[PDB]
Design a protein around this ligand. Sequence first.
Ligand code: MG
Ligand code: MG
Ligand code: MG
Ligand code: MG
Ligand code: MG
Ligand code: MG
Ligand code: MG
Ligand code: MG
Ligand code: MG
Ligand code: MG
Ligand code: MG
Ligand code: MG
Ligand code: MG
Ligand code: MG
Ligand code: MG
Ligand code: MG
Ligand code: MG
Ligand code: MG
Ligand code: MG
Ligand code: MG
Ligand code: MG
Ligand code: MG
Ligand code: MG
Ligand code: MG
Ligand code: MG
Ligand code: MG
Ligand code: MG
Ligand code: MG
Ligand code: MG
Ligand code: MG
Ligand code: MG
Ligand code: MG
Ligand code: MG
Ligand code: MG
Ligand code: MG
Ligand code: MG
Ligand code: MG
Ligand code: MG
Ligand code: MG
Ligand code: MG
Ligand code: MG
Ligand code: MG
Ligand code: MG
Ligand code: MG
Ligand code: MG
Ligand code: MG
Ligand code: MG
Ligand code: MG
Ligand code: MG
Ligand code: MG
Ligand code: MG
Ligand code: MG
Ligand code: MG
Ligand code: MG
Ligand code: MG
Ligand code: MG
Ligand code: MG
Ligand code: MG
Ligand code: MG
Ligand code: MG
Ligand code: MG
Ligand code: MG
Ligand code: MG
Ligand code: MG
Lengths: 178, 259, 134, 60, 143
Amino acid sequence: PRAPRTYSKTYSVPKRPYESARLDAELKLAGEYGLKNKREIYRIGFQLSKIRRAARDLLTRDEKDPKRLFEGNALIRRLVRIGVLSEDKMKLDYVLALKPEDFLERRLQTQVFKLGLARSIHHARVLITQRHIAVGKQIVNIPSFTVRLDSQKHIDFAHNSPYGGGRAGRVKRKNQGK
Amino acid sequence: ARGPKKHLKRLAAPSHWMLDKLSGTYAPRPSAGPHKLRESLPLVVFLRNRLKYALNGREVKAIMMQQHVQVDGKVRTDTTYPAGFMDVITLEATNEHFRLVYDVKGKFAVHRISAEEAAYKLGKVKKVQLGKKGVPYVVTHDGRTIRYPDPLIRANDTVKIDLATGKIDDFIKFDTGRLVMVTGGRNLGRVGVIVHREKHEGGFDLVHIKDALENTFVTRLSNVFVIGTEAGKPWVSLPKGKGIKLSISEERDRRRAQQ
Amino acid sequence: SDAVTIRTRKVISNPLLARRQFVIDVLHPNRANVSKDELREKLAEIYKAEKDAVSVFGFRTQFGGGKSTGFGLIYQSVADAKRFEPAYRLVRYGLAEKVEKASRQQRKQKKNRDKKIFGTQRRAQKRAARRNAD
Amino acid sequence: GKVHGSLARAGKVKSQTPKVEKQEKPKKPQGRAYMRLLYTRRFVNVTLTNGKRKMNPSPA
Amino acid sequence: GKGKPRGLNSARKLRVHRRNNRWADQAYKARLLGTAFKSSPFGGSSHAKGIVLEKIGIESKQPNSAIRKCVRVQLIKNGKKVTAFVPNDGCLNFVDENDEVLLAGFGRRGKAKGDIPGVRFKVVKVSGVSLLALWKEKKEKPR
RNA sequence: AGGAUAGUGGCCUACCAUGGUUUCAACGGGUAACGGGGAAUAAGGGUUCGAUUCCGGAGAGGGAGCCUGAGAAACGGCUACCACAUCCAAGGAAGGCAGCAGGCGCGCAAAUUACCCAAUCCCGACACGGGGAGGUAGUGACAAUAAAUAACGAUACAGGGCCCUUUUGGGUCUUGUAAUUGGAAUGAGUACAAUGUAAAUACCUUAACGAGGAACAAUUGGAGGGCAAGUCUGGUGCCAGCAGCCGCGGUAAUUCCAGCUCCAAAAGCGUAUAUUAAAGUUGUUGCAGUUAAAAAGCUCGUAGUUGAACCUUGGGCUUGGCUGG
Ligand SMILES: [Mg+2]
Ligand SMILES: [Mg+2]
Ligand SMILES: [Mg+2]
Ligand SMILES: [Mg+2]
Ligand SMILES: [Mg+2]
Ligand SMILES: [Mg+2]
Ligand SMILES: [Mg+2]
Ligand SMILES: [Mg+2]
Ligand SMILES: [Mg+2]
Ligand SMILES: [Mg+2]
Ligand SMILES: [Mg+2]
Ligand SMILES: [Mg+2]
Ligand SMILES: [Mg+2]
Ligand SMILES: [Mg+2]
Ligand SMILES: [Mg+2]
Ligand SMILES: [Mg+2]
Ligand SMILES: [Mg+2]
Ligand SMILES: [Mg+2]
Ligand SMILES: [Mg+2]
Ligand SMILES: [Mg+2]
Ligand SMILES: [Mg+2]
Ligand SMILES: [Mg+2]
Ligand SMILES: [Mg+2]
Ligand SMILES: [Mg+2]
Ligand SMILES: [Mg+2]
Ligand SMILES: [Mg+2]
Ligand SMILES: [Mg+2]
Ligand SMILES: [Mg+2]
Ligand SMILES: [Mg+2]
Ligand SMILES: [Mg+2]
Ligand SMILES: [Mg+2]
Ligand SMILES: [Mg+2]
Ligand SMILES: [Mg+2]
Ligand SMILES: [Mg+2]
Ligand SMILES: [Mg+2]
Ligand SMILES: [Mg+2]
Ligand SMILES: [Mg+2]
Ligand SMILES: [Mg+2]
Ligand SMILES: [Mg+2]
Ligand SMILES: [Mg+2]
Ligand SMILES: [Mg+2]
Ligand SMILES: [Mg+2]
Ligand SMILES: [Mg+2]
Ligand SMILES: [Mg+2]
Ligand SMILES: [Mg+2]
Ligand SMILES: [Mg+2]
Ligand SMILES: [Mg+2]
Ligand SMILES: [Mg+2]
Ligand SMILES: [Mg+2]
Ligand SMILES: [Mg+2]
Ligand SMILES: [Mg+2]
Ligand SMILES: [Mg+2]
Ligand SMILES: [Mg+2]
Ligand SMILES: [Mg+2]
Ligand SMILES: [Mg+2]
Ligand SMILES: [Mg+2]
Ligand SMILES: [Mg+2]
Ligand SMILES: [Mg+2]
Ligand SMILES: [Mg+2]
Ligand SMILES: [Mg+2]
Ligand SMILES: [Mg+2]
Ligand SMILES: [Mg+2]
Ligand SMILES: [Mg+2]
Ligand SMILES: [Mg+2]
């Protein structure tokens, strides 16, 4: 038959289901970033847990090792590219010091609210889900869309949105048309 | 298993064709021909995946049935014909001549050549022996049989094929200092000069090859193809990159400067 | 409003099939999309070719609308186009009539029914008729 | 072990439990909104009593 | 020297000794002996269908005092007879003689649970309808 | 030595020797055993699995024997027997779904008797024919990805936050409450249409329609401990039942049956079974053996395992590549 198509899981659950310290930390963290459920926090922790594992393996190698230099710099460059890592902390020791709030800062939901286009973070998600926000000339309706540094300046209302110069929406047309 | 296989699973195709996983269940099974199945390039892959002249397998058959494609100066209509190393492909409608030479990345490069260079080819001598009525002959890497060769020609030498009469113009003796491209193994596509030939009776002889950057690698004698009488003097035009292998860090640096 | 904009990229001249082939980018703001028939008319005017020598297919609209990407062919003549085209595209363009045949079940059942007859059908049915003296 | 017994009392308590209908109460928010409701209730308007914090205080 | 060989060429003694001594692990014995395949009423399956033979009722163990309401079921796959508990308040009234019931374990993986003596299975479905659905009046028994 | 084979060969025959394997486990038995690439889990070391997208092998109900052919001991080829089993005018004849779909049976356990060669490729005398190979759709909560179920105001009212200020009385800006009040936004759905396709469906785009209880209404398990969340209300009263384990139930039950409230995960949640970590409870890393389980009654002893030290060191000379600076 045809070749299999690869797929993989993008999250992992905690070993202890009930722990007040972790439950309170997650809910406090979900409320700050307007997340739908706990799985969106597990997803960040999962990809950060494997970033650390990659960093540990390179750190055991000698400095100036060809693999450590190539993949370590590439991983740092990618993290700097998405704005998670600062430009003055490209040492692979600050990579281990990264925290989940660094990643939630770079979501589309966080940037829409932090750019003043929305009143609150929960307004940001519904704006995104309702096809109002466009990055560049492309409409993006994924709240977890990770904004790159060069894409940061191009977040604005969609050109065909009611809030960004488009026509009036369904509700207004029904009222003013009577 | 009661007989010869006639299909090729997509996953089982040679990796240097660079076929995608999900385009279908099967891959083009190269026909019997001058080149081995694993070391060939079917014309369907060349006309559709490489040149992208044809959009699908139906179109490559339409191209070849109008007599456009010539391999080594003869019109070929077999869509899965196993073209191989040093083969010449002529499309006089587009006025293009190609030679199948490996690039340094291990794949068959799209190497355009002039019409003057497309009038001959090189073949590695596999064996020299006597035929019926005591007539000596040479077998090249593409299955060619040339009678009455120069009596100095021996195995592992390279001959220059007139490619229109099939005769030998001249040859290169296998010896230290000859220019070589590697046609097998993980050093496939690299170009260098012979530094030292290490003999092993009953086993496999090993050849030490020095890159233009004075990088040394070892490969089996069966993967050695003599292409020049000395360094910097190849008998055919080399593909872009000149068969010099760069490390991934060097490639990243070169790519950064180019862009 | 309208202002349909057409861009061509990856253009390859293909005298092997007597045609030019390219990727088509269509910019249609304030417009759901552009029909293949309307693209063929526009493409003929832009490149001064016969409308029947232009073939477009495989279009998809990007997310949010306002832009589509496809593939296009322009032949040197209508005769060349009719020779090197799939049947279904010529039926799309009206250059051919959809061939009418029975379903695959009927063709296969008829093929297997004829497999039980050796010789001409006229001989087989005349002999079968003779057996059924009725 | 000795195993036997009258089967006549099966479902005794559930059968005689007085049926009480659920009051038609407002729907709770779903999805992201419910996480928003819980977050404020636990970190914005804290209802603790000098160190005594209860999620479900019985009326007392 | 820790009572086991340490020489670099003593891998055979170490491999055989470990192989010999894993037989003391009862979990290991059941996997290789195939005891679930040979001895278990389910034959190693998670579930098994059967026919209810009779409603009887089992007295609970001390210090508890109650009537655990079970059924006697003859398995279709091998004809063996087992006792299966009928969970929840009054679900015994949903199960009649000569009904087809789907069984599952009690979750203690072959041992009895709680005060119920000698019962290792529970009733999951009757007549192809979930017993839980019957208890919560989501569905009605097809009869 | 011959015969046979495409060919080596006890492959077979004639004659002749007495050899061949084995405690470094032969031989035999079992396998709920096709092998591998690989899968699950994983600090390290490991444990468990691999019928199944690729490769190799084997089979076409069970055996055996063959024809044709380069290639088959082929089974959508034949011959014969066994077991099943079809039509019959009773003389005879014809079978093989572990191919696709479908049916019966088995079961805890698995979908349509659909469309097509347009793509991927294969076969043929072949640019043209064929292909249940293959592709498309149907069923599909196997698993996997992303991700709706609401957002923002207006006032009211409360607190904090400030400021006019001594407090007082205010102005006023941040939260919370509002059967307490609005106007915006959108896709689920549907739909002209275009795109998609061999033709369709669906997706993507997109006119018109499409949200206040926005009934366009999220569920599954729990609330004594482990383990997050009730000593609330009613019912029962060692009964009914719960309870993985410890335990709960004999008249205010923190555990049953319910109502309310709350907790956890959420388009998912629970149960059963297996397996992995936890397990340093299989321990090579890395267990224990006086008394918790466990030194053979004691010596000898073959295989196995394991075995004291010792043989060009030091010095000197030049010497490249690099790494503090
Ligand atoms: Mg809590
Ligand atoms: Mg050949
Ligand atoms: Mg040739
Ligand atoms: Mg016929
Ligand atoms: Mg016929
Ligand atoms: Mg034993
Ligand atoms: Mg025991
Ligand atoms: Mg085990
Ligand atoms: Mg077993
Ligand atoms: Mg007890
Ligand atoms: Mg009995
Ligand atoms: Mg049942
Ligand atoms: Mg012999
Ligand atoms: Mg022989
Ligand atoms: Mg086994
Ligand atoms: Mg088996
Ligand atoms: Mg196995
Ligand atoms: Mg496998
Ligand atoms: Mg396998
Ligand atoms: Mg099996
Ligand atoms: Mg599987
Ligand atoms: Mg296979
Ligand atoms: Mg076979
Ligand atoms: Mg069968
Ligand atoms: Mg077959
Ligand atoms: Mg056979
Ligand atoms: Mg068959
Ligand atoms: Mg037949
Ligand atoms: Mg008769
Ligand atoms: Mg039949
Ligand atoms: Mg079938
Ligand atoms: Mg199933
Ligand atoms: Mg069915
Ligand atoms: Mg086809
Ligand atoms: Mg099929
Ligand atoms: Mg598809
Ligand atoms: Mg799903
Ligand atoms: Mg809903
Ligand atoms: Mg719809
Ligand atoms: Mg629709
Ligand atoms: Mg159409
Ligand atoms: Mg509930
Ligand atoms: Mg608990
Ligand atoms: Mg608690
Ligand atoms: Mg009471
Ligand atoms: Mg416990
Ligand atoms: Mg009371
Ligand atoms: Mg009470
Ligand atoms: Mg309490
Ligand atoms: Mg409890
Ligand atoms: Mg309760
Ligand atoms: Mg939650
Ligand atoms: Mg471990
Ligand atoms: Mg134990
Ligand atoms: Mg222990
Ligand atoms: Mg260790
Ligand atoms: Mg111990
Ligand atoms: Mg101990
Ligand atoms: Mg122990
Ligand atoms: Mg004792
Ligand atoms: Mg003693
Ligand atoms: Mg002894
Ligand atoms: Mg000894
Ligand atoms: Mg020594």
